[PDB]
């Protein structure tokens, strides 16, 4: 044969990616495919070094299978690594020796013609690097350097640590081409579980009610060894249940068993999503008149924009207005609305103790993992606590602006696009420091500042009403009123808190304390 | 088919330390470790052992082991409440109330 691009492997049962397979090919059809003689004429080299790095639990050794069994070559043997790494050197002479003995051999024997030996490492980090590491990563070297000329030599390694790696290893004609293996992938991990519950099927045990769909929604970063086990808990809460009741004849997996061992046993390794809607978003938003719907308005009109134009890849926005006036809320709404495929927040609330370099350090990892998706937004709440400020002094970190004075303006890769949302309650030290330039766009956020105003949202909340409505309404018109949104909640709270009758005392008196003037 | 056999292992984290450095000539407790993971798990599929290890501080354990496929299902033991307290105590004190040593005071 001459080729072989055939590419049922996504679909064979390893999900994986499809955008290896055409370099990988490429490069294996141009090294051997043509006919060794004129190779030879043209003195070109074979290629020999593969490394497969990334953390654990990925599925790297079934990809190292997967390409030495479609590769027409002999079976493979394979050490955990460290195992040949005696103690002792001299058996890291004699058994390092022994393995390429094996393929030497079969070389002579067989002369130039012959198959290629795939010889699969793990854990290379571990060696390289107390003058052991010296003269083992040299015999190592040895054999493949061209003093041992071996022709036939599939040396495909793993590895989880790329920065305690000797660079000669990778140096030209060592390794050469690299890969890792990300996440389990949101489709990918549909695919498995579809494997291993059609694989369940076989025998029709599964209940119908069972669906892979949301299963594969709900669990988030789960490698595919944590789904083997969140099947394999499901199978034993499932025979616990039964045991504790012809049931063997009537013997089903039910959904509730599913949720119940996701929710008991599995762990999972990286699940967020249903954590920040519902923290920052706590009651919902209410519409109290028409300036709700002017800032909502204006988010989509810009949301559209950065989808869909050329020459303005970057957008950003600022949303400002007095404190207690919920902007954090209207925001991530604004981020919600939109159905972008990344979305992040960056609060200050998980850097409590950071020192400036930390944070730095953070803000630049989370946009350069956002420069990745296709298209995305992000969102950046109090400004000014992220450069800690303090209005004596003044006092804040220089480094932190310099951060995002660089990072506000700093186009992303060919052909992306990026969208940023930024919330603040001090617009004047923000002018001061020259960073209000920056943003394209400023959005107001007002507070209640009339009585029909107040009276329609407290009536939508509920709560007073009917005389109390009334005096509430008798009293407050005619006047003025200035409060935050979020300060009425808690006044109505504390209002409540009194005997039955006297509520309406406590709460006019409560707010016609506090509000002072505009 | 047959039986199970189950070893107990106390003091589990006193043979099995981190197989970083050790800082120590020969390798005897990197060996000991390396042979037990062989021997859990290999090659060879071993269906009926079962191994208990116990430790005071799970800090000081490999991670080889704690990794699925070698020792899964951790539980911690904490401290009673408020009714094992009481049963405790009522363990503890059985004897006593058996041959009438215990006055009505308390
Ligand atoms: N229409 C609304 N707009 C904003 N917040 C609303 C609205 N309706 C209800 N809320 C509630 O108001 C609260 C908004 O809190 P948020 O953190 O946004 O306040 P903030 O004034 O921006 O905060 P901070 O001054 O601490 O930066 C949330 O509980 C949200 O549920
Ligand atoms: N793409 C995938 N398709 C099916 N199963 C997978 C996939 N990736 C991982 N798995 C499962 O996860 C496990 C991966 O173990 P393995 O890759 O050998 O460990 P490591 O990733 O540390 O080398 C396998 O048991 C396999 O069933
Ligand atoms: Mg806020």
């Given at each position: 044969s001459?080729?072989?691009p055939?590419?049922?492997?996504?679909?064979?049962?390893?999900g994986?990616?499809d955008?290896?397979?055409?370099?990988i090919?490429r490069?294996?059809?141009?090294?051997?495919?043509?006919p060794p003689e004129?190779?030879e004429?043209?003195?070109?080299?074979?290629?020999?070094?593969?490394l497969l790095?990334?953390p654990?639990?990925?599925?790297?050794?079934?990809?190292?299978?997967?390409?030495?069994?479609?590769?027409?070559?002999?079976?493979?043997?394979?050490?955990?690594?460290?195992?040949?790494?005696?103690?002792?050197?001299?058996?890291?002479?004699?058994?390092?020796?022994?393995?390429?003995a094996?393929?030497?051999e079969?070389?002579?024997?067989l002369?130039?013609?012959?198959?290629?030996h795939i010889?699969?490492?793990?854990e290379?980090?571990?060696?390289?690097?107390?003058?052991?590491?010296?003269?083992?990563?040299?015999?190592?070297?040895?054999?493949?350097?061209?003093?041992?000329?071996?022709?036939?030599?599939?040396?495909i390694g793993?590895?989880?640590?790329?920065?305690?790696?000797?660079?000669?290893?990778?140096?030209?004609?060592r390794?050469?081409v690299?890969?890792?293996?990300?996440?389990?992938?949101?489709?990918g991990?549909?695919?498995?579980?579809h494997?291993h519950?059609?694989?369940?099927?076989?025998?029709?045990?599964?209940?119908?009610?069972?669906?892979?769909?949301?299963?594969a929604?709900?669990?988030?970063?789960?490698?595919?060894?944590?789904?083997?086990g969140?099947?394999?808990?499901?199978?034993?809460?499932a025979?616990?249940?039964?045991?504790?009741?012809?049931?063997?004849?009537?013997?089903?997996?039910?959904?509730?068993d599913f949720?119940?061992?996701?929710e008991?046993d599995?762990?999972?390794?990286?699940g967020?999503?249903?954590?920040?809607?519902?923290?920052?978003?706590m009651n919902?938003?209410?519409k109290?008149?028409d300036?709700?719907?002017?800032?909502?308005?204006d988010?989509?009109?810009?949301?559209?924009?950065?989808?869909?134009?050329?020459?303005?890849?970057?957008?950003?926005?600022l949303?400002?207005?007095?404190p207690?006036?919920?902007?954090?809320?209207?925001?991530?709404?604004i981020?919600?609305?939109?159905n972008?495929?990344?979305?992040?927040?960056?609060?200050?609330?998980?850097?409590?103790?950071?020192?400036?370099?930390?944070?730095?350090?953070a803000?630049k990892?989370?946009?350069?993992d956002?420069?990745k998706?296709?298209?995305?937004?992000?969102?950046?709440?109090?400004?000014?606590?992220?450069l800690?400020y303090?209005?004596?002094?003044?006092?804040?970190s220089?480094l932190?602006?310099?951060?995002?004075?660089?990072?506000?303006?700093?186009?992303?890769?060919?052909?992306?696009?990026?969208?940023?949302?930024?919330?603040?309650?001090?617009?004047?030290?923000l002018?001061?420091?020259?960073?209000?330039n920056?943003?394209?766009?400023?959005?107001?956020?007002?507070?209640?500042?009339?009585?029909?105003?107040?009276?329609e949202?407290?009536?939508?909340?509920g709560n007073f009403?009917?005389?109390?409505?009334?005096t509430?309404?008798?009293?407050?018109?005619?006047?003025?009123?200035?409060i935050?949104i979020?300060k009425?909640?808690m006044?109505?709270?504390?209002?409540?808190?009194?005997?039955?009758?006297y509520?309406?005392r406590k709460?006019?008196?409560?707010?016609?304390?506090?509000g002072?003037?505009? | 088919?047959?039986?199970?056999h189950?070893?107990?292992?106390d003091?589990?984290?006193?043979?099995?330390?981190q197989?970083?450095?050790?800082?120590?000539?020969?390798?005897?407790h990197?060996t000991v470790?390396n042979q037990?993971?062989?021997?859990?798990?290999?090659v060879?599929?071993?269906?009926?052992?079962?191994?208990?290890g116990?430790?005071?501080?799970?800090?000081?354990?490999?991670?080889?082991?704690?990794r699925?496929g070698?020792?899964?299902?951790?539980?911690?033991?904490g401290?009673?409440?408020?009714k094992?307290?009481?049963?405790?105590?009522?363990?503890?004190?059985?004897?006593?109330?058996?041959?009438?040593?215990?006055?009505?005071d308390?």
């Open positions: 001459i080729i072989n055939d590419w049922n492997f996504e679909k064979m049962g390893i994986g990616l955008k290896e397979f055409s370099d090919f490069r294996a059809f141009a090294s051997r495919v043509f004129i190779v004429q043209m003195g070109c080299k074979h290629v020999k070094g593969i790095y990334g654990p639990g990925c599925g790297k050794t079934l990809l190292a299978r997967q390409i030495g069994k479609m590769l027409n070559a002999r079976e493979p043997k394979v050490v955990n690594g460290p195992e040949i790494l005696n103690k002792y050197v001299g058996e890291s002479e004699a058994n390092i020796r022994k393995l390429f094996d393929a030497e079969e070389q002579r024997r002369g130039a013609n012959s198959g290629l010889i699969i490492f793990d290379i980090d571990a060696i390289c690097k107390t003058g052991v590491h010296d003269t083992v990563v040299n015999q190592l070297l040895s054999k493949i350097d061209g003093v041992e000329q071996l022709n036939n030599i599939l040396v793993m590895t989880n640590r790329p920065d305690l790696i000797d660079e000669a290893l990778l140096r030209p004609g390794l050469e690299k890969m890792e293996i990300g996440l389990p992938d949101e489709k991990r549909l695919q498995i579980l494997i519950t059609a694989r369940m099927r076989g025998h029709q045990l599964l209940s119908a009610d069972v669906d892979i769909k949301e299963l929604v709900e669990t988030k970063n789960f490698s595919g060894a944590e789904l083997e969140l099947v394999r808990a499901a199978q034993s809460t025979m616990n249940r039964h045991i504790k009741a012809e049931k063997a004849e009537s013997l089903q997996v039910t959904r509730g949720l119940a061992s996701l008991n599995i762990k999972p390794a990286f967020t999503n249903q954590e920040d809607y519902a923290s920052y978003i919902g938003i209410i109290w008149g300036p709700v719907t002017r800032v909502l308005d988010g989509e009109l810009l949301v559209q924009q950065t989808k869909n134009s050329d020459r303005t890849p970057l957008v950003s926005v949303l400002e207005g007095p207690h006036s919920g902007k954090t809320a209207l925001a991530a709404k981020a919600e609305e939109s972008f495929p990344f979305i992040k927040i960056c609060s200050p609330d998980k850097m409590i103790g950071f020192s400036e370099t930390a944070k730095c350090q803000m990892k989370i946009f350069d956002a420069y998706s296709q298209l995305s937004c992000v969102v950046v709440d109090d400004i000014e606590r992220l800690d303090v209005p004596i002094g003044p006092r804040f220089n932190v602006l310099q951060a995002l004075l660089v990072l506000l303006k700093k186009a992303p890769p060919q052909g992306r696009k990026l969208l940023i949302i930024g919330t603040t309650s001090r617009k004047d030290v002018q001061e420091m020259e960073m209000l920056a943003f394209s766009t400023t959005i107001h956020v007002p507070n209640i500042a009339t009585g029909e105003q107040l009276l949202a407290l009536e939508l909340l009403k009917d005389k109390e409505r009334t509430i309404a008798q009293q407050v018109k005619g006047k003025k009123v200035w935050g979020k009425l909640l006044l109505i709270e504390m209002s409540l808190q009194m005997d039955p009758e509520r309406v709460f006019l008196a409560l707010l016609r304390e506090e002072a003037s505009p | 088919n047959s039986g199970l189950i070893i107990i292992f003091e589990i984290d006193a043979i099995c330390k197989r970083g450095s050790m800082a120590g000539s020969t390798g005897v990197d470790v037990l993971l062989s021997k859990i798990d290999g060879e599929q071993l269906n009926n052992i079962l191994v208990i116990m430790t005071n501080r799970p800090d000081l354990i490999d991670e080889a082991l704690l699925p070698r020792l899964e299902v951790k539980m911690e033991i401290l009673p409440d408020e094992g307290r009481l049963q405790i105590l009522h363990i503890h004190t059985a004897r006593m109330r058996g041959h009438q040593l215990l006055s009505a308390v």
